[PDB]
Amino acid sequence: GDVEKGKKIFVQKCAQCHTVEKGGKHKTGPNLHGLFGRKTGQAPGFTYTDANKNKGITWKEETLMEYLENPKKYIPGTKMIFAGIKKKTEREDLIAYLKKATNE
Ligand code: HEC
DSSP states (O other), X not given: OOHHHHHHHIIIIIHHHTOOSOOSSOOSSOOOTTTTTSBXXXXXXXXXXXXXXXXXXXXXXXXXXXXXXXXXXXXXXXXXXXXXXXXXXXXXXXXHXXXXXXXX
């Protein structure tokens, strides 16, 4: 969980659709600094495509571990234009971005 790159690689490409700031009218990507509290698809106003909006759990390190680790095989594939990183563990680093954000 290298939040160092977590908040980085996150705010690098995900900063665009996921500007982590006051939620409010969400956009293509809601400030995912509360994923552990955001349903698999319950973004206020931005109700994820039936895919995430039809799950039933919350973005917990494990659930997202299945998404960030298998993004094009979990969700990141419909609108998300991302689905992998240079190496591979780069996804665990983001879990540090949220696990820390979402946590508090
Ligand atoms: C950095 C690697 C990123 C993280 C972490 C997340 N995203 Fe995104 N994202 C985008 C869209 C348009 C969607 C909706 C997909 C659809 O409509 O089918 C999403 C979805 C997510 C979700 C799902 C949360 C839920 O409740 O369903 C998570 C957890 C998430 N994203 C985290 C848009 C973009 C985007 C635009 C180009 C980027 C760069 C990212 N997302 C990157 C990340």
